[PDB]
Amino acid sequence: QWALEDFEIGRPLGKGKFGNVYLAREKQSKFILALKVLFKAQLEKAGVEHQLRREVEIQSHLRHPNILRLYGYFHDATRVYLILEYAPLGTVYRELQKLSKFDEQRTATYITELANALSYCHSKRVIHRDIKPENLLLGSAGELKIADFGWSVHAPSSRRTTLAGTLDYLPPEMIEGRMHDEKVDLWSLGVLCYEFLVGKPPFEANTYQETYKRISRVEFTFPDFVTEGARDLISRLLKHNPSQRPMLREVLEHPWITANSSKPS
Ligand SMILES: Nc1ncnc2c1ncn2[C@@H]1O[C@H](COP(=O)(O)OP(=O)(O)O)[C@@H](O)[C@H]1O
Ligand SMILES: Cc1onc(-c2c(Cl)cccc2Cl)c1CO
Ligand SMILES: [Cl-]
Ligand SMILES: [Cl-]
Ligand SMILES: [Mg+2]
Ligand SMILES: [Mg+2]
Numbered sequence: 001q002w003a004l005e006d007f008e009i010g011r012p013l014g015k016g017k018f019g020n021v022y023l024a025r026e027k028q029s030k031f032i033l034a035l036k037v038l039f040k041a042q043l044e045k046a047g048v049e050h051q052l053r054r055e056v057e058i059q060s061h062l063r064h065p066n067i068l069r070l071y072g073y074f075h076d077a078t079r080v081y082l083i084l085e086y087a088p089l090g091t092v093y094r095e096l097q098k099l100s101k102f103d104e105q106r107t108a109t110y111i112t113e114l115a116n117a118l119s120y121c122h123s124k125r126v127i128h129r130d131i132k133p134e135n136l137l138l139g140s141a142g143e144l145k146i147a148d149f150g151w152s153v154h155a156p157s158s159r160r161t162t163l164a165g166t167l168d169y170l171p172p173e174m175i176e177g178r179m180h181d182e183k184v185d186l187w188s189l190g191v192l193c194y195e196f197l198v199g200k201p202p203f204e205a206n207t208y209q210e211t212y213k214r215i216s217r218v219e220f221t222f223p224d225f226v227t228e229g230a231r232d233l234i235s236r237l238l239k240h241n242p243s244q245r246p247m248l249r250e251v252l253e254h255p256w257i258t259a260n261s262s263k264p265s
Helices: 040-046 049-061 092-099 104-122 183-198 208-217 228-237 248-253 255-260
Strands: 007-015 020-026 032-039 070-075 079-084 136-138 144-146
Touching: 007 032, 032 040, 040 049, 040 079, 049 070, 049 079, 092 136, 104 144, 104 183, 104 248, 104 255, 183 228, 183 248, 228 248, 228 255, 248 255
Parallel strands: none
Antiparallel strands: 007 020, 020 032, 032 079, 070 079, 136 144
């Protein structure tokens, strides 16, 4: 169907390990979108063809206001192209670098929206496994949206591939290459909530080997300005044994969330 000639390319939107993303308009309809460009030689080299295929399939058959749509794809001897919904207000990552910290109202609202999209996701036994600020995008009304389904699978699961970048958002079971399930996503939720209110993730460290340590021992402390309601939720999500982590109905109805969030479930 589609080909490169059908588009006009505009400004760079972001680089990833593999993805190079651009603003684009389709010629006969003037439709604006995002074009994620991958190099076949980089994909062969690293052996992650299976990740790309899975990203394509999951993200095209899901439909939820808090999850970024995937429309289509095509390739051309050098490259594979994905056609994505455009997110006009950017990443949560950049927003956190702008403000340094989020207030309780902003944080709670963000957590509500993640918990809603993840709930829809888990109801098909799909687990994301890569929830971090670089992969949360912002809609035109400011609403949060989940992207980059490259690492997602069906539960239960064993780990596949080498871990490339940061460990900061991973649960103990996953860094230790043990078996994992839906509860990895909930651990990341607690990691995320803490980073919203403090400005940095709870297990941050100078080296790989020591981040590894702090994560498997669950060594985090709160600074003085973290309120009791916050502390309660974050302590319930960051438990070493997964089955002791709360379900998502419990996150959505926690008193601290219901008091500060500005959207319903
Ligand atoms: N749909 C989009 N709209 C706007 N910016 C995007 C979009 N998709 C990606 N980006 C930017 O490009 C970056 C890389 O995208 P991503 O899909 O996560 O690639 P990779 O899987 O290689 O990390 C994002 O962190 C973001 O900054
Ligand atoms: C759906 C899909 O996603 N990536 C590809 C793909 C293509 Cl076109 C070429 C090389 C490697 C890959 Cl992984 C396909 C098609 O099998
Ligand atoms: Cl269209
Ligand atoms: Cl639930
Ligand atoms: Mg990414
Ligand atoms: Mg990816």
